[PDB]
């Protein structure tokens, strides 16, 4: 996630945050995808992370199961 | 990882345009289980790998 | 109120549990049935006339009946308790010997079949174990799970029924019509088992049973049993002659041969019944049968 | 008796896999019903409880064969056809005995 790499950038500057413009941007594209397995089509599972699944239910599951 | 199922197979083209319309990006991974022919899935190849300029790009 | 467990069975498990009000010991035979399915037959009426009509007919050679209750799934039978049967006398246990006591077995068996044939009832379930014995030694039958009310005409019915060891020759070929000879065939088979204490007809299916019966008794010819090639389901075997019945059995008198030959007749229209069998020269001699007190009982 | 305990153990393991599969469905249903950013730590601990459940199952099992039985084990369908019994017994040496026919 982008929240983990942000803490490493703040420690490199040594008592100083990277402005603050690019801090709120770290919430756009996430890690999502599809996997083909025994289901002979698609099995929806990506990575062990958790922010990559929360922001998706309000688009595809809301219009079709 | 929370796995799902299949929605009548045909429903697939409409999902590729609704995810990219907002902001997240999709990335269909690997693995498969349909249309097989070359015997199995391990064929024949020597395990002695060479050329470090290709192994580093392979693991990446 | 469960008391003790006995054994299993063909399609009903025998349970020795004391019923209510009536202090008599009841041997409940629970029939495995269904109830989970929607449009399911559930209870089979093959024993409906047994636990509803036996209360009216009273006979000492016929098993008794008290009440009946159930609900499709578990149909608990209410029948009187019996001590031992007949298979334990021959099979496995060979210590119990009956010196000249077989006459009392066939005398009380023909009287039970004669009372059922008078009321137009056939016991289409003969096998070497239904002859249940009580404490007093009264020979009674088991259950009527395959009874039927017949009449003068004989039409087509079920096939491939009855225990394969005791099968009539006309039933193995799949004949549509039958008669009194169905219940009169196993009468001599049970008598043939108590003599040599060995299975007289150790056969398998309908094809193997035809080989054992024909190689010992013979093949029905035209003069013996007519109307044989007209049946569709027919097989051609060897010209089996006929082994005599007075040399196979060791302990067998002259009067005993006059009844065994009449029971193993291949002609159902000419086969002896129950009234003519009790009036033979075997059941009217000096060696009288025992009432039931001197008859030994298994351990 | 050994084969009966092995077939029964497959149903016990199959039921736990179905509950674990249905557990991920309940987490996705309530993932956004009452979550407006602060509720996100429960999803991270959801796989941790699913990973430890699989570790406690792969060890106490002698690798059961891949079968397709029913974990609930109910009135399974056979054939419901008048198939009778054996293939006409078919003798060869000494005959034995075959159970009678029922309705």
Q: How far is CA A42 from CA A35, B7, B16, in A?
A: 5, 9, 13
- What's the rounded Cα separation, in Å, for the pair C46 and C145? 6
Answer whether C205 touches D (CB < 8 Å): yes
Answer whether B37 touches D (CB < 8 Å): no
Answer whether C166 touches D (CB < 8 Å): no
What is the three-class DSSP state of C292? Answer: coil
Chain A residues touching D44 at Cβ < 8 A? 50
The contacts found for C229-233 with CB under 8 angstroms, 24 or more apart, are C231/C173, C231/C174, C231/C175, C233/C173, C233/C174
- Residue C13 pairs in a beta bridge with C30
Chain A residues touching B24 at Cβ < 8 A? 28-30, 32, 55-56
Q: Strand C4-5 vs strand C12-18: parallel, antiparallel, or unpaired?
A: antiparallel
Experimental structure resolution, Å: 7.2
> Do you know the residue count of chain C?
299
C-beta of residue B22 within 8 angstroms of C-beta of residue A56 = no
User: Which DSSP symbol is given to C123?
Assistant: E
For residue C21, how far is the Cα from the chain centroid?
Answer: 32
- What's the rounded Cα separation, in Å, for the pair C252 and C191? 11
For chain C, list the domains and their CATH numbers: 1-83 (3.30.200.20), 84-299 (1.10.510.10)
The single residue listed with the structure tokens 């008592």 is: A15
The residue of chain A with its CA nearest to that of B14 is A60
- For residue A43, give the nearest of B4, B19, B26 by CB distance: B4
Which alpha helices (H) appear in chain D, and where do they start and end? 2-29, 41-58
How far does A51 lie from chain B, in Å, by closest CA?
11
Chain A residues touching B12 at Cβ < 8 A? 41-42
- What's the rounded Cα separation, in Å, for the pair D80 and C11? 18
Contact between chain C and chain A (3 or more Cβ pairs less than 8 Å apart): no
Q: Which residues of C are catalytic?
A: 125
């Amino acid at each position: 996630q982008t929240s983990d790499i942000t803490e490493y950038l703040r420690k490199l500057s040594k008592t100083g945050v990277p402005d603050g413009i690019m801090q709120f941007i770290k919430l756009c594209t996430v890690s999502y995808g599809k996997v083909k397995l025994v289901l002979k089509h698609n099995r929806y599972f990506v990575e062990s992370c958790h922010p990559d699944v929360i922001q998706h239910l309000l688009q595809d599951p809301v219009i079709r199961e | 990882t929370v796995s799902f199922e299949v929605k009548q197979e045909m429903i697939e083209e409409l999902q590729k345009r609704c995810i990219h319309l907002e902001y997240p990006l999709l990335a269909e991974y690997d693995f498969r289980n349909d249309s097989v022919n070359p015997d199995i899935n391990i064929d024949l190849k020597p395990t002695a790998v060479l050329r470090p300029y290709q192994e580093k790009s392979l693991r990446k | 109120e469960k008391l003790d467990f006995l054994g299993e069975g063909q399609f009903a498990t025998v349970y020795k549990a004391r019923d209510k009000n009536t202090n008599q010991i009841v041997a409940i035979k629970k029939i495995k049935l269904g109830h989970r399915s929607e449009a399911k037959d559930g209870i089979n009426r093959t024993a409906l006339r047994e636990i509803k009509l036996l209360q009216e007919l009273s006979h000492p050679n016929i098993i008794g009946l008290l009440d009946a209750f159930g609900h499709k799934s578990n149909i608990s039978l209410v029948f009187d308790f019996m001590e031992t049967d007949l298979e334990v006398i021959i099979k496995d246990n060979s210590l119990v010997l009956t010196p000249s006591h077989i006459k009392a077995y066939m005398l009380m068996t023909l009287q039970g079949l004669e009372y059922l044939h008078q009321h137009w009832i056939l016991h289409r379930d003969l096998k070497p174990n239904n002859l249940l014995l009580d404490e007093n030694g009264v020979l009674k039958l088991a259950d009527f799970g395959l009874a039927k009310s017949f009449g003068s005409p004989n039409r087509a019915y079920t096939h491939q029924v009855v225990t394969r060891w005791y099968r009539a020759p006309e039933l193995l070929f799949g004949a549509r019509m039958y008669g009194v000879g169905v219940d009169m065939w196993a009468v001599g088979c049970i008598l043939a088992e108590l003599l040599l204490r060995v299975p007289f007809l150790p056969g398998d299916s309908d094809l193997d049973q035809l080989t054992r019966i024909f190689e010992t008794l013979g093949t029905p010819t035209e003069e013996q049993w007519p109307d044989m090639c007209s049946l569709p389901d027919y097989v051609t075997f060897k010209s089996f002659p006929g082994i005599p019945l007075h040399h196979i059995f060791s302990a067998a008198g002259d009067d005993l041969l006059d009844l065994i030959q009449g029971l193993f007749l291949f002609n159902p229209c000419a086969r002896i019944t129950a009234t003519q069998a009790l009036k033979m020269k075997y059941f009217s001699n000096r060696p009288g049968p025992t009432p039931g007190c001197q008859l030994p009982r298994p351990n | 008796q050994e084969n009966e305990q092995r077939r029964l153990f497959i149903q016990k393991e199959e039921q736990l896999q179905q509950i674990l599969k249905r557990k991920n469905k309940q987490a996705f249903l309530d993932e956004l019903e009452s979550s407006d950013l602060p509720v996100a730590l429960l999803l991270a601990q959801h796989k941790d409880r699913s990973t430890q459940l699989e570790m406690q199952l792969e060890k106490p099992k002698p690798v059961k064969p891949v079968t397709f039985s029913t974990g609930i084990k109910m009135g399974q369908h056979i054939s419901l056809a008048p198939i009778h019994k054996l293939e006409e017994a078919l003798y060869e040496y000494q005959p034995l005995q075959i159970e009678t026919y029922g309705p």
